Amino acid sequence: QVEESALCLELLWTVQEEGGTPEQGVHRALQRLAHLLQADRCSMFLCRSRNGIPEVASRLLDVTPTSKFEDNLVGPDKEVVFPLDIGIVGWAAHTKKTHNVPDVKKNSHFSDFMDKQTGYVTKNLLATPIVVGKEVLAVIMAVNKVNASEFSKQDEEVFSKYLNFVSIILRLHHTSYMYNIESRRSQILMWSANKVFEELTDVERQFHKALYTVRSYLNCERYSIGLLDMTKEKEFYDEWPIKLGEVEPYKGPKTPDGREVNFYKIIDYILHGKEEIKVIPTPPADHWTLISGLPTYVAENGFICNMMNAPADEYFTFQKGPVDETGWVIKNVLSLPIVNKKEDIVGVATFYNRKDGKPFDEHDEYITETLTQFLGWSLLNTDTYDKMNKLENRKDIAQEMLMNQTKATPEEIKSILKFQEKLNVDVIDDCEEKQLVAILKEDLPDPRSAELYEFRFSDFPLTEHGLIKCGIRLFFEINVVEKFKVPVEVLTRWMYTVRKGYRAVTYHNWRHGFNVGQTMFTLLMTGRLKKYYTDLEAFAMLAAAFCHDIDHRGTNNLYQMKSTSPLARLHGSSILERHHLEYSKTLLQDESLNIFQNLNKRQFETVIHLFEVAIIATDLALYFKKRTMFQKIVDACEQMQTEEEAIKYVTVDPTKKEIIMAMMMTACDLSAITKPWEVQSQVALMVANEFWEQGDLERTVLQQQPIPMMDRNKRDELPKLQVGFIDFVCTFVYKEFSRFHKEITPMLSGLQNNRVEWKSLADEYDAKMKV
Amino acid sequence: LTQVEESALCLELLWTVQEEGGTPEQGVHRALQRLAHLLQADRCSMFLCRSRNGIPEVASRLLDVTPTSKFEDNLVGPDKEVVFPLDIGIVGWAAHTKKTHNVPDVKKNSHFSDFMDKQTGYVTKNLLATPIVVGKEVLAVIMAVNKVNASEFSKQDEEVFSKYLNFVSIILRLHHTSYMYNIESRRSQILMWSANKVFEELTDVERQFHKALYTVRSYLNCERYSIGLLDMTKEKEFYDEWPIKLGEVEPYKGPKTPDGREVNFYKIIDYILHGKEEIKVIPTPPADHWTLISGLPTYVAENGFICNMMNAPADEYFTFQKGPVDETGWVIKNVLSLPIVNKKEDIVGVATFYNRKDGKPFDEHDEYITETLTQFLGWSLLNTDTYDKMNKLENRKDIAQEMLMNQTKATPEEIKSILKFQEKLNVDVIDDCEEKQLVAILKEDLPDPRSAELYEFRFSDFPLTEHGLIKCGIRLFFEINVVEKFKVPVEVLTRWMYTVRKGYRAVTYHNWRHGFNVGQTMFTLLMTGRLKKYYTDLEAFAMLAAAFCHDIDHRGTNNLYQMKSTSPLARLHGSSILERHHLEYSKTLLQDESLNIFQNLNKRQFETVIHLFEVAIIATDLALYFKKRTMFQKIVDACEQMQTEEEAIKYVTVDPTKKEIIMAMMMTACDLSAITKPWEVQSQVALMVANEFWEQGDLERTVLQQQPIPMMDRNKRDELPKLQVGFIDFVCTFVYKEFSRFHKEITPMLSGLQNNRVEWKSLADEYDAKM
Amino acid sequence: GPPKFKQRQTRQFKSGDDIPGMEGLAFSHLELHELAQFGII
Amino acid sequence: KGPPKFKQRQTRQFKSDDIPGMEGLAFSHLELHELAQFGII
């Protein structure tokens, strides 16, 4: 027992490897049990699994007491591989049971292939697979008991007691290796995800990033990826020779979706010597990856193929010698297909010889399949990148063609800027800006005869081309062209393009935009509110007033939300006001149309902010929210004893000026109520028609009951609702402005007269329904 | 005997760790029992090491271990363990030093900790320490205390303790390797499932994070966790800033993220894993929400640390719920909170993981797992930002296309100018007239097809106004007798003709005049050329519509210019850039119901007409023409052998590919048909073409800084006739000679080329007289 | 005769009704009605 | 008192055309010249 205890303590100490290789401790235990059993040539068969087929491979051979470990160790270059259906070690690995077979030549499972290879005669052998967690790690072999036959049951008992130590060592190594492979998998996934989410890219760049980043965690000496042509159908003119039969139809390798197997690009990652990347566009069939049929075989079939000793196979013509003259030979190959969401093979990844030189087992199959699966999932980013580029290009084309169509032709300019009829040039606008100013200033109607400064001015006698002329006259009267250097041709063009950008709708046509711009002019000049605003700010407000309803479709923000319009999904709030702002800025983007080109960068930044505040301030919900703040501003400005004190109080604070500008733009929008009864009655008819056709759209397309304002059935209720619009929204804007400056007093007077008429018709309706 | 029994008991010790389903703490308990018996010490124990927040600590796992003791009574749970930081206690100093510390009197070392001595009421007077150190990590510090028979541990006691600790180190490293394998398996599965769910589709932050977290649920192994998403709005609207700038509302004071945004959890997603496996989502959760009631999620949103807190309700800073969180008896025990981080380091959210499924505090391995999950979510934020960009781009495109189409479409006045129903039928604005009556009223107003030589090859467009071109085009469709056969509405036909006219830009040659002359050539080749006998009336209708719309929106440039300028057309459409644009825009124009001249034919007829349009417009590309000249020549050569016209109709009609090639040749001969016009008309059209090509060359030299080809170059203007002669000798001569062979009726077109060629030679040789 | 090779696995990762919780994922008193009356909001 | 010490995010681990190899990632004989002279192609 004393020497048995000493041998047990020696086994306990050699179990404490403290580093090194467990094969050494197992070899020391095997030579121990060899000298104990009166048997020689003990052996270990490691279990591998390739393609899901289990095999056994001899790892230590010719174990002898007092023999050197280096001679007992057989490397994978000389290992003998047996499938589980060959040899009693295969049957043992299948059954996971202890077998003791004497006279093996009588056993139906004994294989003499090893006996023929080695020339050694075996007669009686003991087999017991090492099994842990139902998994079989090694088959241990005791053979040719000397001086005795049949072994013994006590030999099996001591055999089991030492195979407990063997199982300890093998389980420790198995847990270490499974930790290693699972850490490699997790790091591969983390790095591939980091590189995929870095940006949007086409397939080639994204796969190259991912594979190059993960190159260190795949223990392959080299590997490559081949990308197949993704085109599925041909152009009709390239089918024409095929359909005429002038060219024989292509025959050869085809993917399962039926595309031709054309590797349009190969990426080689060489890691054996110098780490080098090769990108081969349109590689020839003589490429060292493609010269063996295996990548093409994966492209036709799509199996994951682990093939050990690949030049010993007969099907695949693997190169038996160096391929880059560098002395690297193919030994083991693992190829996998990358697939689309639709199972379509985009590429084939082929991983060559493992750095350890061992044949690929199910662990490296698992690693490479998870990498390939992640790559096949990553194609969503490529498909999205292509759809981004197509949507961007289509948008830019549609916007350019729109802007070209809407822009005023040179005839439309020459219709107003009659330079040809007065300077006799007719070919080039070589004339100086002073000449264009001088020739144009005759052609505009004088602002006094047109009454353009007056609050009463009615646009019915004027034509729309006369409205354009009057608009350029209004810009001239503010004296903007000389100060900000706004060219006269681009001024006239911009006015005409703004007109044409107003649709032919019943009320939101160019006449409404012109009357709002004229109200902005007359409030600035005759209402004397320009005392708070710089001429730059006056120029920006007048341009915004002319564009405050540009390309108004003829519908309300409620309609856009209810109709789920692209405008409503693009602009979350103030849908049409943000559309008008975006389109006015789009008109100002063209150099041809930029009446603000001759500004400083900070002045445009100012003009753009005034455009934004003014057009979004044409939203009446914003008006209603900010009424109370404007009222507080007016109340604080009323107690000021000096006019110049009031001017100081407003001018020092940008936010008060912005609120007053918003209130001015709302006085301008609803100005028609202040116009004489004739004009008010016509304009109220126009808005009533616009609201009726909105309600017909709501009832017909959206299939909903319209509000009584939108309903044609309440037509005769129009004047009473008009009265309701006169008190809730316009009196305040106009009473507070009359308090702010008495010069806007008559606009409230106009409202007051118009309200009486609107009350009269309601009393006429009171007469009608009561009888 | 002592050696034998010790070796046997250490063998049995090693086998206890092989018992699958056992625990290593049992084996270490047996080892401590043997150690305490051999060493004659009492109250042996071990302290497992942990790391939290990156600082190390120790905690007792087995107290009061004595020989012949119950394992259940000796094992202390993690809820009863005593935690010591490394800076305190002898166990901490042993863990730091990673070496043996033998201290005989606890009062002689400043590292003595009184905490447990007062906690349990035991007195200590002897201490020997050696950490279990493997892989440069400390797993447990083992303690021997209060040697009953001696006042010191001698060096032989140290050596025996070292050997038993080597066996304990074997056991503890086996358990450590199994645990690290489990940790990396969890992390790998977490990443694989998160990647599978992120690439499943492009979606918003909320949906994508909910999918990822709900899939990884089974692998977090927490009893409870949640995610809070912060509001991402950074800037305010000017109208909501106004009260802040004026001063009506005090400035916001409270928690802020490091970017500066207000900490507003706009959505909370709770994953309850303790029971019933319920998920809830709370939009705009109140501040009394059970996750937010403790300051910890808000503290992470403010700071962005990873917070592992053990005994969270025992802390005083964060005011965790000491009682149950809800009606169910769940209480917070441990917590781990981490932020989700944008690409710009912005805190998008905070993920909080509460107590583990078992009672143990969170170790560094769970911190590692949870940080890899939160990093993966912070990377998939790129997919969410891409989705939002996608929706904005799609909406902007659709708006721009609709506004374009509305601008280009002919107004009702331009319809009425051709279809004078109002001034002749005495009808209102609403069209309720019969289709046959509209036919009868229109058919007077078109020019008769026999005057103005509408069927003749001599047709000159110079004496016609463009309004007469529209009328003649509707006349051309009218003689082919398409309106009554295909049921196309007369008003739809007129509007489509007029929008096709305004579609074609005012360029010098690719204006409406070229489109009309090509449509007239298609008509005359069909009727007078007798090629109508090869095609159905539907196919002829497609020929005419494609012949008119072949050049639609041609900007005045060629495909070389599109490629060279990197035009959005060239990036959208790979090959045949301009013809693919013409096809896409003609299909867009046919897509509106109001313009769908093919609305009243069968779906199969529409697919046929669409393929007809594609073939015709892509076959307008002369590179395709030059490619398929040889095939058309083979067709003509095969068709001339036959001595029966019926045989020719049979031969061509039975093969769709031959009809498609003859259609391509028909359209090619139609495009260049101006070369066959009389000399005056040819000279004027060649002047217009040369002007277009000279302005192309001036544009190309100006904006690409490149030399034009000699044909584009304006300096060789007088070289125009020679290059025109080249165009005579290379292109048109083949088409019109092969057509004259194919049908003698097209013979005058070649003959017109034959005269015009003579005139070009008579002015080219005069250039040889100028030099 | 080529060697027997492993088929690609897809069922495990093949697997939002299945994901729970996806279905959900200012003036004065007088003004609130009369602004909707005129379509001001 | 003061809050417990908590770990900082390990941003340093993944903080980061440098990828090697990314830089790169029909008519008759007479018809090759005269077609370009007319800009037909």
Ligand SMILES: Nc1nc2c(ncn2[C@@H]2O[C@H](COP(=O)(O)O)[C@@H](O)[C@H]2O)c(=O)[nH]1
């Ligand atoms: N009831 C009524 N509403 C008006 C009148 N004038 C303008 N509105 C309303 O005020 C809005 C002003 O915004 P705009 O459409 O001019 O940008 C109109 O769209 C319309 O809803 C009017 O005379 N009567």
Ligand SMILES: Nc1nc2c(ncn2[C@@H]2O[C@H](COP(=O)(O)O)[C@@H](O)[C@H]2O)c(=O)[nH]1
């Ligand atoms: N040299 C010359 N080329 C022509 C003439 N007519 C047409 N082409 C060529 O034929 C092309 C027809 O293209 P499309 O008219 O469909 O845009 C023109 O762009 C131009 O290159 C011509 O009279 N002389």
Ligand SMILES: Nc1nc2c(ncn2[C@@H]2O[C@@H]3COP(=O)(O)O[C@H]3[C@H]2O)c(=O)[nH]1
């Ligand atoms: N040469 C040699 N053969 C061995 C050794 N150990 C086991 N074998 C044998 O290799 C054989 C393989 O197939 P079997 O399972 O039939 O039986 C096995 C043995 O007979 C050894 O150490 N040396």
Ligand SMILES: Nc1nc2c(ncn2[C@@H]2O[C@@H]3COP(=O)(O)O[C@H]3[C@H]2O)c(=O)[nH]1
């Ligand atoms: N009650 C008890 N105390 C122990 C046991 N093992 C060690 N200790 C002691 O508890 C103390 C904790 O802090 P120290 O590191 O200073 O020193 C340790 C000992 O003196 C044990 O098994 N039971």
Ligand SMILES: [Mg+2]
């Ligand atoms: Mg508006």
Ligand SMILES: [Mg+2]
């Ligand atoms: Mg063309």
Ligand SMILES: [Zn+2]
């Ligand atoms: Zn308006």
Ligand SMILES: [Zn+2]
């Ligand atoms: Zn053309």
